[PDB]
Amino acid sequence: PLRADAARNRARVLEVAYDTFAAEGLGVPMDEIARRAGVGAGTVYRHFPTKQALVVAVAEDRVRRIVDHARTLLAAEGPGEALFVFMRDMVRSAAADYGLVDALVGYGLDLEVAAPGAEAAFLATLGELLAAAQRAGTVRADVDVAVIKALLVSERVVRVIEDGLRV
Numbered sequence: 001p002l003r004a005d006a007a008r009n010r011a012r013v014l015e016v017a018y019d020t021f022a023a024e025g026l027g028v029p030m031d032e033i034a035r036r037a038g039v040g041a042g043t044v045y046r047h048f049p050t051k052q053a054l055v056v057a058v059a060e061d062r063v064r065r066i067v068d069h070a071r072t073l074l075a076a077e078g079p080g081e082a083l084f085v086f087m088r089d090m091v092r093s094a095a096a097d098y099g100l101v102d103a104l105v106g107y108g109l110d111l112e113v114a115a116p117g118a119e120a121a122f123l124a125t126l127g128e129l130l131a132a133a134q135r136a137g138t139v140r141a142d143v144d145v146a147v148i149k150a151l152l153v154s155e156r157v158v159r160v161i162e163d164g165l166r167v
Contacts, residue, residue: 009037009039011061013033013034013037013044013047015037017054017055017058018061018062018100021100021103023099024099025106030048033054055106056104056109059109059111059115060114062097062100062115063121067122067125069089070082070086070126070128073086073089073129074129079133079135080132081133081138082132082133083130083138083148084133087148088158091158123149126149126152130143130144130148139166139167140167141167143165
């Protein structure tokens, strides 16, 4: 119950910090991060004793969120279409995840150092969506996840890719 308050509180903070990292960066004080999350500063600090620790906790969370998104998509859209939705969603979310990398950069940190397993998780994720879609017969059999990985006016460029990906 107080467990669940904490769980709500830190998820609130992470999502606000994600948005703050995306748009403004590391210039925004923890206090204002605290304020936008509807929570006090010492609480942020109790989970996140420093700013880089917030940055790394946002990085892990976002990686986990991308992995959960893919599975929700497989459920919601089906094996046939989930890869296409996922790739479009990664595209849409590029500006945000830009601001997160930059933040991870300001601290001399990488994704695979802050969120260990990240590389592998993303790969295995793309891997399952591609296998599912090849199985469903919507995507060409002669493509591997390394090619999907590489593929990841803009909307026109994305449609050629999708159309060249279909069977």
